[PDB]
Design a protein around this nucleic acid. Structure first.
Lengths: 86, 77, 98, 106, 95, 95, 106, 97, 87
DNA sequence: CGTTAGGCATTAAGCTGAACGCACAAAGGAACAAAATAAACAATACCACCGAAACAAAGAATTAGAATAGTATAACGCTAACAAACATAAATTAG
DNA sequence: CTAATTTATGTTTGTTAGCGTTATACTATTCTAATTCTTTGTTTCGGTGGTATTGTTTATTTTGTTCCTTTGTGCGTTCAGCTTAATGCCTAACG
């Protein structure tokens, strides 16, 4: 009905047997129970930094959408360069 | 050991005799503070008081050049 | 009587097959929802390209995999295998994060 | 008859494009003529070092294509390319498969 | 009649056919090679620019590029790249 | 008749006498403040340069400096610096 | 009668010198006139934030001079200046005096 | 005799050296080490005194950063001491190996 | 008892009390005996990196001496900028 | 898109006098440092345990994929008009 | 303590916002397909506490060992003003 909306509680969408696969890629053999909320918070602050950088990048350009090039520049400014998007 | 020492300048022989003077008049004094005071007093001396020391240093320089005329400094590692 | 494996036995095979395979391990739609949830607070009504959310997912998985490698290094160093949140906070602290 | 600057040096990378990128990249006011030739040389040698190890990885895996898993393998297995690309992560690349020896059973 | 993306996509394939005739390449790996070429170009040109500024040189010649190559690239990659580079300028100056 | 070191040594002392009239400053701390001013100038001007390149702008205006300030300086320092900056250009344009 | 650009903005840092450093620093071809005024503003505010905390540290230590131990104390005790200067170390500065609580006796 | 407890003098030296801003490496042996290493890269390399002072200051800063990270890693493993595995871990996690 | 002198070994000058002081500044309550040689090697490879970069700097400018600014520029590129020795 | 033939104006190699920087003479305890030692407390080896995490099967619930239509938006081109580089005369200031 | 370095005025010019248009990927909807997240019941094993041995660090004293701060002199290194060839950038043409 209305295009405008608001989102909430999306940090539960990154689930616990989807954290366990990211852990077991990195070589972890056993994962404790309290890892999940702390890793979600780490992910939250990392996404908040890189997304705020991408939003300032796209708002300087007088634009309304977020390209992948601005996410690449935002990860370049944090010193984690991404290869594969230009 | 065969090492040729540098000849003394004016301030080294002056501070030598004056540090021997201070060590025969003053006990319990650290030598760094002695040399700080000796440099201070040598910079507050007038140039009229230093010509015997610089002349004596010039006598050591002419004795050094007459003693080793083919001498040239060679720094090594 | 069904047959059961041991804890850790299946875990090594999972570690091997996830280190071999190169796909993304968290689904694209919850990541789209979380990225659009977070980016409201900086400017509302933003459109996210699918390539931008994919690039954020690649860098997100890379950052968490590197952090879990350092977490396993720190947990192995303290003579453990079960990593703990203090290992995450330590490996963030040494790294220059906080 | 005139011959291109990329094959004047006997290379593949275009000297004119790296010259233009050095000009409009705003690195100095002037740029020497040996600079793009040298830069195309070190660039061509660098991707030659990448693609040779990538082809040996893909032929070692009995594949015929270079997927970025092969690029990540060729970069992470090396020593002096790992120092050049230590902070850079690779899209759809995965990790170098190595498991710590204390996790493994005896 | 779209404007064209200026990229290094053909020359990476030329180098690949010079070094490996049988194996093909993906498109996304070609994009990765394009991003890598642009990353290394930025690193070398940034070090050459700041070296010309530290010596108050208004001209970047091949010496600054050679010094920046010796700065960034570690190990035998440095001297291999310098030998390739000097081979290239001797080729370019002999002709 | 030595050539003079161009540095920011007087203006740090002017700011210090504006903000703290009683306390003096060392010489080596003045050198530290000079190095800090040059470091922050390089950070802000480098981000302004790469932002003007990412948008294909050949002119660095105050918008790029404002965006770079919002990029580098964390926390309330960002908005405090932006308020100080906009106060400065409104002062400079009102006169 | 004409008045300087540093006090046109009502500041201490010279607008002309930061304008000249933006020109000869090779950051762009052109530079806007609001750029050096904005940059001198954020610079003057930044060293004002440094020198105010440094003066409070030196007056807190019952000293009358700013030695770099005071600058290191004022930077490391802060939160949002510590993120700006986290990698930078300070000459003759020492460390922030803090001892871990498990090393201390009970 | 009244000898102090093991570590109490260490604690007083901790507070003294942390309150101090002095250089903890003597200037002559560091000069000898710098002019001993740098000959291997190029010969006839004199150094300015400010340059070797800068190298000593930066090595002091780098080592006290390495040692606070080392003590973090050692406290984390329930150890008051420092073993070289802590230095290995602090160099590995920082991404220097 | 008697003084011992060893030829070369430039790394060794960095004495054992001058490393105990470096760790006491870092807030370390106990240092084992196996730390000094490892810390010597760490300082050795650190100075090798910074010295090689400064040597390439001063060699690019054809200067036989190593100024302070070259050490500043060599330390800047590894992420550890020195304040105070000029920009 | 990429290369090539002639000016010209900027720029690095060449050169020399001059100014900088560093080592070193004596001194002579001070401050540091190596070495030997008592022992005291920290690292560590081993053992129990218990609750916490892994494993499994089922279903649920979620994402994937696809066709599609609207649709905000972004990316193309003209155009003015505006803002910044540049040539040339004060001034204050400052090392 | 007076050269020099910022500031102001008019001119050119080249950059950029405004405008129009349109394409184009973005967002939403509704279906099936599939796949995977969450619940619940085993089960087994690693983090943690507690105690004992040991091994090695620390704090100290003794005895070498060096250092440190002072000015003048010698020598090698760098640097700045002036000469001068090298060279790269601009334009016109070509492919």
């Amino acid at each position: 009905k209305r295009h405008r909306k608001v989102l909430r509680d999306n940090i539960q969408g990154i689930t616990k047997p989807a954290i366990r696969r990211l852990a077991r890629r990195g070589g972890v053999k056993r994962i404790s129970g309290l890892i999940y909320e702390e890793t979600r918070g780490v992910l939250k602050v990392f996404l908040e930094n890189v997304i705020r950088d991408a939003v300032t990048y796209t708002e300087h350009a007088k634009r309304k959408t977020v390209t992948a090039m601005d996410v690449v520049y935002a990860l370049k400014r944090q010193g984690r360069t991404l290869y594969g998007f230009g | 050991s065969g090492h040729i020492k540098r000849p003394m300048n004016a301030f080294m022989v002056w501070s030598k005799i004056e540090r021997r003077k201070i060590m025969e008049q003053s006990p319990d004094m650290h030598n760094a503070e002695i040399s700080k005071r000796l440099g201070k007093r040598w910079k507050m001396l007038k140039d009229s008081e230093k010509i015997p020391f610089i002349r004596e240093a010039e006598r050591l320089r002419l004795k050094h050049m007459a003693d080793y005329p083919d001498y040239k400094y060679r720094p090594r590692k | 009587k069904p047959h059961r494996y041991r804890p850790g036995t299946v875990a090594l095979r999972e570690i091997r097959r996830y280190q071999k395979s190169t796909e993304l391990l968290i689904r694209k739609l919850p990541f789209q929802r979380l990225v659009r949830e977070i980016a409201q607070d900086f400017k509302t009504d933003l459109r996210f390209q699918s390539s931008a959310v994919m690039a954020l997912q690649e860098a997100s998985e890379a950052y968490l995999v590197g952090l879990f490698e350092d977490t396993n290094l720190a947990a192995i160093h303290a003579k453990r295998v079960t990593i703990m949140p203090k290992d995450i906070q330590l490996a963030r602290r040494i790294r220059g994060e906080r | 008859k005139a011959k291109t600057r990329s094959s004047r040096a006997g290379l593949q990378f275009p000297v004119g494009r790296v010259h233009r990128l050095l000009r409009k990249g705003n690195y100095s006011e002037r740029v020497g003529a040996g600079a793009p030739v040298y830069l195309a040389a070190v660039l061509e040698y660098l991707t030659a070092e990448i693609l040779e190890l990538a082809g040996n990885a893909a032929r070692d895996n009995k594949k015929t294509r270079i997927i970025p898993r092969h690029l990540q393998l060729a970069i992470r297995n090396d020593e002096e390319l790992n120092k050049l690309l230590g902070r850079v992560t690779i899209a759809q690349g995965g990790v170098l498969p190595n498991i710590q020896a204390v996790l493994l059973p005896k | 009649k779209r404007s064209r993306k200026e990229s290094y996509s053909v020359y990476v394939y030329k180098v690949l056919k010079q070094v490996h005739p049988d194996t093909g390449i993906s498109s996304k790996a070609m994009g990765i090679m394009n991003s890598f070429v642009n990353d290394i170009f930025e690193r070398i040109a940034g070090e050459a620019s700041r070296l010309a500024h530290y010596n108050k040189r208004s001209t970047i010649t091949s010496r600054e590029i050679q010094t920046a190559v010796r700065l960034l690239l570690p190990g035998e990659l440095a001297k291999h790249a310098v030998s390739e580079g000097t081979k290239a300028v001797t080729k370019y100056t002999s002709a």
